[PDB]
Amino acid sequence: FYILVNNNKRIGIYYIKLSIIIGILGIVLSYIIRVELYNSGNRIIKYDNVNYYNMVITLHGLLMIFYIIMPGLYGGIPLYILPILSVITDIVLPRINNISIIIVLISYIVVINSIVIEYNIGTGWTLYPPLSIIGTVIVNMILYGLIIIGISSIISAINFMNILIVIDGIIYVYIWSIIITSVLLIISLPILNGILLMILSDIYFNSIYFILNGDVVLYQHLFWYFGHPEVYILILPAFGIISIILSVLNNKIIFGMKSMILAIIMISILGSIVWAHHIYTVGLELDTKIYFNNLTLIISIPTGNKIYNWIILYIGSYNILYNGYQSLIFSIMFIIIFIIGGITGIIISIDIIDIGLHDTYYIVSHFHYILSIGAVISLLAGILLLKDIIGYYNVIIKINKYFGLLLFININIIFTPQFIIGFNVMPRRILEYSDNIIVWNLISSIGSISTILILLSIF
Template identity: 45%
Template sequence: NIMTGLFGGIGNYLYPVLLGSCDVVYPRVNLYSLLLQPIGFVFVVSSIYLEIGSGTGWTLYPPLSISLLNVGIDFVIFGLLAAGIASTLSSVNFITTFSSIKAVGFVIDRILPTAWSIVLTSFLLLLSLPVVTAVFIMVFLDRHYNTMFFESSNSGDPILYQHLFWFFGHPEVYIMILPGFGIISLLLSTYATKEMFGNQTMILAMASTALLGCLVWGHHMYTSGLEADTRGYFTTVTILIALPTGNKIFNWVTTLQCVESIRSIGLVLFAILFIINFTIGGTTGVILGNSGVDIALHDTVYVVGHFHFVLSIGAIMSLLCFIIYIQRMLFRTIFSNKVTLIISPIFMLSVCLTFMPMHFAGFSPLPRRIPDYP
């Protein structure tokens, strides 16, 4: 739903406008993409009610996913494959639209970060989706056709699954949040009535984040037996992501400085709270990026608190900003500033009260997926 709202919503409603086009190159392709999404959703949800359900967690790690021979896991695989095909269709469409711009007076240097966020997200999807599609097909073949890709008792390697899965799994984080960066940049520049500070550096920072995000999948696997040199590499590159992220924060804050008047203070407050929320999550991410610390905090609620701050809540807040922003463009209605001013601090306070204690409990350490200390 987050990807459909941010990537699909911004891509279909704002992306062509920002490029000076009336529509994407292949509108029907995006329609097919939209129709595939609910099909995948139905498959995944149906898996809960079939036999004993999927019962493997969201990562589908073998050997559990290849030893539980129930149809629920197959439905999860089919649903994820359908969603992957849908995202691939949209990505190809957006990249083709970008490469075929013929608007009068169009200059590539003047493209807004919001449009670039969709382009970068599309490239990330095209890079990572074939890998995760292949790994799900391999799991399906292991389950039904006696292949041994991940069966350790017959020369298979479950760690291979982790490498392939997380090569998609970590870029997926940036696939979800990059469009959020784009909409926050657009909101701040629009309602602060000034151009985004460091427009080109913002684009470069997002591109750097996308590139580095493809090189750090191993930080999800510190406890799987990686060598010390390998852990050192992933630690270095993971912490290196803080540099372009800090650049984005700096650009957003600087854009708001020395502004004489701000239109729609309620919506801008939501964007500011997003920046605060993302800064907290990013700071805890730097701590987790260190392999020594991560081994101690692995599978604790500290990790849950971190990724909810940096991804889940960040993506939801940017999606809410996009919904309020787009309804003004499409329907000419004015979302009450008073309502936004009331909702945004309550929302942020609730997030802090829910997930901030997890950081302290994680150091205790409280294992995740367990409601109390064992």
């Protein structure tokens, strides 16, 4: 059978397969955005169809976060190796594992169908009210997709937590990475569901939470109380992969295993209490701002310890071993790239700097360097390491120095200029802009078309 299979390794393959498929839609949307932003004027979207651009950016964000990177790094690699790393025959909950992937596909079909049938409008992937609650039915459909996705995420989290009860070996760092992400999901998702239900109540049940005398800033608190834990639910599995690859390929035992583990635990606790750095410009109280700014800067400490522990893993490794394997290059590239993204995160963490840089393309470049570059490369590196175990073929990736170089160069051509226009300043979530920002926007656009072309050479 195909759909009935409960094999945990087969389901892991399904997650990667579906992430690539849905990923095609994600990348296409990204190409639309960059094409439009190539100059000033209308290029591929009419001025009377500006609502489509708002929908393109909204769906891009939602799909890449919840339907591509999360299903790939928390559903794909985890479901394939975690039961093996735990020296257990199979996953604890076989039937739940099957329904989770089916749920993801069904929620994807709902979203894309809503593109085709509903009027196309957008409110960002952060679905801020009151804009989200005064929209058309496409917003209702997107809400159903998120809630359905939430069901799959929570049940998958329950599945991984049960490994503690059955693990027959040692909890390796990677296993710790997934367990903590599962804990972060169990604690953050129920809050998200509540606020999403309130968005529905105002959309569909004549509720009045997001109209005057009701505080719209309330949504942002509950949303981001899940929002930021989400960005670490998306990065922590990547960290777990990086640890395995560096140790295996360099033939070096992980250094400071317990510090790696305790760094992951620390990032989670801290990541659960820093959400309001996304709400700096709303007008929060001075002491609140100072608390959140202080705790946000603390997250660098545990995150920094992991980075340096990775570096010493690559240091001192034997020279005779060939170092041009794509998996090793990607793992090393992750350290180089993640530091850029994190440092810019610390810059935006200072609220006074953030006043200038909120809702600008500097924020875009910041989270792209971590996700669009770092997380993607980590997932690629992990799949590449498991090529023999997974068994896929008909691609030229394993040893392809051209692909790695071209990808690194062109991805930086896209997002490095977006840091510059952040002090120009070019707001986010816009399509038209002043003529004096064309140069940098044009350079980034040339980078986007080039990256897409390099994706064709792998076949």
